[PDB]
Design a protein around this ligand. Structure first.
Ligand SMILES: *P(=O)(O)OCC(C)(C)[C@@H](O)C(=O)NCCC(=O)NCCS[C@@H](CS(=O)(=O)NC[C@H]1O[C@@H](n2cnc3c(N)ncnc32)[C@H](O)[C@@H]1O)[C@@H](N)CO
Length: 1042
């Protein structure tokens, strides 16, 4: 007969998507104490339930439409009394009988009845009266009213008086109220208001770092209840007495949640009961609206200013409360399980209701309030000045003990405002005593080290072990003495061509023993080396050389025709040993010199060079040799490309300990089969992987091949991406070789924190990723909120780094240096590096990585600034706008590791169609290859959220079906290869010009392809050949070559 109204349409969609038996059935019991006429109260329950028209409501699926009608024909249960008294000993057997009622399938569709009562005690001078309703029939405001009426009927009968009349308005009058309201000018006014609220609304925020669930949250929750006995709230309200008590508790709760969210602007929910003023006041159905409230903490405001602007908005919201929140959702693009508009939910309405049966005490006890997806906070400031609260919390996102600590923080804020009502919102602190002390000991990493040099340490160790093998590759082997002879000769040669202390020397060499010699010789001259990836395009190397102004480029003879264009550069070809002339040190390098300059992607469109002090890298390497000692039975794998800071400890750490360093062949760092042959062939004990590569390498193994190639490993390090716990566990199962997690941006000296990723320590990680852990020597980790206060354990903050390991700064960019190397407010005169990483302290002191606060990404461990690509794309002709976006194009390629690929979105200035294939060709002239987007898509306009910012979630993925098919694949290699693409990409490939990377392949997936093709033909095909020949037709011609 009638449509679902008010809270029902929201409650309906919410259960359709729920995946639990009774997430939407409210239930509770009342604890009656004394003599009770149970058969009469049974009778009273029946008469009471008849007076609530909404309890006989029946529903039907009207081909999508949903309709309700009250069955005046339905007759009610008499409740069953249960004699469980002098039976089983516990009265928790009754609590089991109640808890068991809610494990049934009580959803509408189950066809079970939606209301249930029964009487239990069974007369132990006490009684448990149990009640459950589906939340489509009842608010938290009407079921205590229904109970009171059953108790009124009961009490009346005892007096010998006729059954009381119903106090209940028909719920139908409510339907008319909204059916008349939805067809009214106030609907158009209310829609317009909430649409402005959406444009201005801050994003959701939660104390849990995990993303907010839009569906299927548990109706079993934590239900904390806390009373504040300190009376500092009493002294607070009376010391202001302009705020309206409730307003004060709200503003405190807003400061408290903002501090736990690490947000100064966030969206929370607020509960309007919608009873007064409505025909619903006396109806029994659910009329209840949780509405979005935009919280804006202002650091410069006082606490009553916060209360005032909040109440102003709550007043304004109250005027428009009739607009169902559910309607706001579909007004926004979001629909059906999409991310919520707010996280926490604030509330003032009561926690219990009373019953006055004569000579009988009654106590309600709540069992199911309904699901809470995140966290909900009820505030009760009494007229007598005490304060109490009730926290409801998702059982998957929180636990009781930490919630108690946070609430004690809420007592601390109250105590702090009690002592200073003029206290600003920004000067308040939620650090418990002894928490700040505990973070002190964690940063107490002071280890006194003498002033020294790489060149010093290397020379000192070659004096100890002249004849121990030091440096080898396929073609050469050098003792520590023979090594120092070649270092000192090249360093003398470098001075003959002008390299002086303080200079830069750029290095563009293939991987051999001579790469290492070149670096040791440069530091020996007192210069700093600058590594060039010759895989970068010509135009980009010109930038780095023009910016760093190196005195000298060391290269090979066939590479310098690329550099004939650079003006005023001097080159040296180095690819064979020099006549020795002793091994004495030159003693030219000094602790304040720069040791090296590694460039990194920079937001402005132009890479920036990070300059690292000689002392900062000495600290890093002496610390490693204390924490993971090497002994010269060790063999270290030079596997990492020289343009990534990780290579530095590979180039230098073995030689300060006496161990051997062995060079891998070129391109072997990206071919997991080649690494297996490498490690076994040289008996490697020590090496490094990026987590994405560890994954590809694990995937290349079985236990037997693991025992054959990794048998010699003793120490493996991992860094540059979040290290997932389960990956470490697969590694432990294959090799038993200890594995360690290291963290650090280039702007400190390679790594500032460590953590064990094996053994007992790994067996304790309950999280998805391994902690980044603990500071190295002379290094501190600061985790600070947006106001640069320190954050307590468990709360997300911005990570800052301190100590001697900090970089000298950005090459030639004193503004960017000032931006990121900021003054440490906790150590005046000292700097502190702003990482851009978000992180939190775990309860054992270790730090957990959580994400970035900016547009920097680690695609497969390699650092990219989406801004760099954006600005380069916008410089292309007829490109007005350009947005780079990282995404997983093809879920079948997410075998493991980071599977993201870069996608450019372009809007043309002219509005004409753009030659995206030519534009992407052009980008390969400017950008390093891993920074060219694999797909460029042109859009008529960029998709925008309600606030006007970019809506990446609306950005269309690339189609796996090209609209312009090419030649079908020819018999032979092309047919094979097509098939292999299909095997790994998960779609049929019948196009010879299909692009492995455009179809969602990535370099880790290329490593699996190369192995598979190398089986399906006798000949080898390298993963590097899949990079170059991106397509079927190109990849075929490479293996058909005769
Ligand atoms: P395909 O051709 O697309 O890929 C093929 C392969 C995998 C072979 C290719 O991707 C490859 O050769 N990759 C090697 C990547 C690599 O070695 N990268 C440099 C190491 S990271 C560097 C610091 S950094 O500034 O570049 N970025 C630091 C930054 O990264 C995050 N981070 C580092 N360590 C972390 C841990 N342990 N957990 C969580 N996050 C971590 C942070 O965001 C940090 O600011 C080195 N200092 C790192 O050791």
């Amino acid at each position: 007969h009638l449509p679902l109204v008010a809270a029902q349409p929201g409650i309906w969609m919410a259960e359709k998507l729920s995946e639990l038996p009774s997430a939407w059935s409210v239930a509770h019991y009342v604890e009656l104490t004394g003599e009770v006429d149970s058969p009469l109260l049974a009778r009273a329950v029946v008469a009471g339930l008849a007076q609530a028209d909404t309890l006989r409501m029946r529903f039907t699926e009207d081909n999508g439409e949903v309709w309700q009608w009250v069955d005046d024909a339905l007759t009610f249960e008499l409740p069953e009394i249960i004699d469980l008294r002098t039976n089983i000993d516990p009265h928790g057997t009754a609590q089991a009988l109640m808890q068991a009622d809610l494990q049934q399938d009580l959803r509408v569709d189950s066809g079970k009845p939606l209301v249930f009562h029964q009487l239990i005690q069974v007369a132990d001078n006490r009684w448990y009266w149990y009640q459950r309703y589906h939340h489509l029939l009842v608010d938290g405001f009407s079921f205590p009213a229904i109970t009171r009426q059953i108790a009124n009927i009961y009490c009346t009968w005892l007096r010998g008086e006729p059954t009381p009349a119903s106090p209940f308005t028909p719920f139908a009058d409510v339907v008319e109220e909204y059916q008349q309201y939805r067809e009214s000018e106030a609907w158009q006014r209310d829609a317009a208001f909430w649409a402005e609220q959406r444009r201005q609304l801050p994003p959701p925020a939660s104390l849990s770092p995990a993303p907010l669930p839009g569906r299927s949250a548990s109706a079993d929750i934590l239900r904390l209840k806390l009373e504040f006995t300190d009376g500092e709230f009493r002294q607070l309200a009376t010391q202001l007495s302009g705020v309206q008590r409730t307003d004060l508790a709200l503003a405190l709760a807003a400061l408290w949640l903002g501090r736990l969210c690490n947000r100064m602007d966030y969206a929370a929910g607020f509960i309007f009961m919608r009873r007064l003023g409505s025909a619903a006041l006396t109806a029994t159905g659910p009329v209840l609206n949780v509405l979005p409230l935009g919280i804006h903490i202002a650091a410069q405001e006082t606490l009553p200013e916060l209360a005032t602007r909040l109440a102003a908005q709550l007043k304004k919201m109250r005027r428009h409360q009739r607009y169902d929140a559910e309607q706001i959702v579909r007004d926004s693009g979001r629909a059906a399980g999409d991310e919520p508009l707010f996280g926490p939910v604030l509330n003032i309405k009561v926690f219990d209701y009373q019953l006055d049966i004569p000579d009988v005490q009654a106590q309600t006890h709540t069992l199911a309030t309904g699901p809470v997806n995140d966290l909900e906070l009820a505030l009760f400031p009494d007229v007598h000045g005490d304060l109490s609260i009730e926290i409801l919390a998702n059982k998957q996102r929180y636990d009781e003990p930490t919630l108690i600590q946070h609430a004690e923080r809420l007592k601390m804020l109250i105590a702090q405002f009690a002592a200073d009502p003029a206290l600003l919102c920004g000067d308040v602190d939620i650090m418990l005593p002894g928490e700040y002390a505990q973070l002190a000991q964690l940063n107490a990493t002071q280890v006194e080290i003498p002033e020294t040099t790489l060149s010093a340490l290397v020379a000192e160790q070659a004096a100890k072990t002249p004849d121990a093998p030091a440096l080898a590759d396929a073609r050469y082997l050098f003792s520590y003495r023979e090594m120092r002879e070649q270092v000192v000769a090249l360093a003398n040669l470098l001075r003959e061509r002008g390299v002086k202390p303080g200079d830069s020397v750029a290095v563009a060499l293939p991987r051999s023993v001579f790469l290492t010699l070149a670096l040791h010789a440069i530091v020996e001259a007192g210069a700093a080396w600058l590594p060039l990836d010759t895989g970068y395009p010509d135009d980009r190397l010109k930038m780095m050389l023009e910016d760093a102004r190196p005195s000298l480029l060391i290269t090979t003879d066939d590479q310098l025709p690329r550099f004939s264009d650079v003006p005023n550069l001097t080159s040296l070809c180095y690819n064979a040993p020099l006549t020795p002339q002793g091994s004495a040190p030159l003693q030219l390098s000094q602790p304040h010199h720069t040791a090296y300059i590694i460039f990194t992607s920079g937001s402005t469109g132009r890479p920036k060079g990070v300059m690292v002090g000689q002392t900062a890298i000495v600290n890093r390497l002496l610390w490693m040799q204390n924490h993971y000692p090497l002994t010269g039975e060790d063999v270290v794998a030079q596997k990492t490309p020289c343009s990534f800071d990780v290579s530095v400890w590979e180039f230098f750490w073995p030689f300060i300990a006496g161990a051997k360093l062995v060079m891998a062949e070129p391109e072997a760092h990206r071919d997991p089969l080649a690494m297996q042959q490498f490690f076994a062939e040289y008996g490697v004990t020590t090496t490094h992987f990026v987590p994405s590569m560890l994954a590809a390498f694990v995937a290349s193994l079985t236990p037997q091949t693991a025992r054959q190639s990794c048998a010699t490993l003793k120490q493996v390090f991992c860094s540059g991406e979040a290290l997932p716990a389960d990956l470490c566990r697969e590694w432990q199962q294959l090799t038993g070789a200890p594995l360690h997690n290291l963290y650090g941006p280039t702007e400190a000296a390679v790594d500032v924190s460590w953590y064990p990723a094996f053994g007992e320590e790994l067996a304790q990680v309950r999280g998805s990723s391994v902690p980044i852990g603990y500071p190295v020597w002379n290094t501190g980790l600061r985790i600070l909120d947006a106001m640069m206060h320190p954050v307590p354990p468990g709360v997300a903050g911005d990570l800052y780094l301190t100590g001697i390991q900090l970089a000298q700064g950005y090459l030639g960019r004193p503004d960017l240096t000032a931006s990121r190397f900021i003054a440490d407010p906790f150590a005046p005169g000292e700097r502190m590096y702003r990482t851009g990483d978000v992180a939190r302290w775990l309860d054992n002191g270790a730090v957990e990585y959580l994400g970035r606060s900016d547009d920097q990404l680690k695609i497969r461990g390699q650092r990219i600034e989406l801004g760099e690509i954006d600005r380069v794309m916008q410089a292309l002709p007829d490109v007005e706008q350009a947005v780079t976006h990282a995404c997983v194009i093809n879920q079948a390629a997410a075998t493991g590791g980071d599977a993201r690929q870069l996608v450019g979105y372009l809007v043309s200035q002219s509005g004409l169609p753009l030659d995206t294939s030519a534009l992407q060709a052009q980008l390969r002239e400017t950008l390093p290859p891993h920074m060219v987007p694999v797909v460029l898509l042109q859009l008529p306009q960029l998709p925008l959220s309600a606030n006007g910012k970019l809506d990446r979630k609306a950005l269309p993925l690339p189609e796996l079906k090209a609209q312009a098919p090419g030649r079908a694949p020819k018999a032979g290699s092309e047919t094979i290869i097509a098939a292999a693409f299909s095997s790994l990409l998960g779609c049929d490939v019948q196009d010879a010009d299909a692009d492995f990377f455009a179809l969602g392949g990535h370099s880790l997936l290329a490593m699996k392809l190369a192995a598979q093709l190398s089986r399906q033909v006798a000949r080898q095909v390298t993963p590097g050949q899949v990079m170059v020949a991106s397509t079927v037709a190109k990849l075929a011609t490479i293996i058909d070559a005769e």
